[PDB]
Amino acid sequence: GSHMGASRLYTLVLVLQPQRVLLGMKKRGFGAGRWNGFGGKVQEGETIEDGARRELQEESGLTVDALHKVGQIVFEFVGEPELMDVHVFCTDSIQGTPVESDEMRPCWFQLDQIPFKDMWPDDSYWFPLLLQKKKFHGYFKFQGQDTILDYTLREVDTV
């Protein structure tokens, strides 16, 4: 449903090949210490997909042929005025070999060895839908970094 208030655009890119997925260990700032897809804030003057590519390149060195819209997640953090509006993409057309950046240390994971205990707890809900090639809309309300207070999740035809 609707979540009122100013939101800030973010991207999240999952490089998902047939038997493995690329994740990055976040090395600094909010969420350091957890594995996640590549992304960050969308800037003034670039499209959401541009920002997704830019972030993947800054964080892993990779470029891709194509990105595919797979989901949208809204995050609320208790006490934080701004909502996070996260646009999730997937790709299987990487150009290059991933390398470590200031922000992220990339590693490949087998699809049955996804490190959910060292990921954001919301990923346990929506990551399986990405693996199943289902498009989704999610909402998660957090108290701090560990506790989901409320959430919604459904599949969509249009991201």
Ligand SMILES: c1ccc([C@H]2CCCN2c2ccnc3[nH]ccc23)cc1
């Ligand atoms: C793009 C890249 C990284 C993030 C991380 C760090 C800031 C906050 N953040 C999250 C918060 C909550 N769930 C989440 N699931 C994956 C990420 C995530 C967000 C967008």
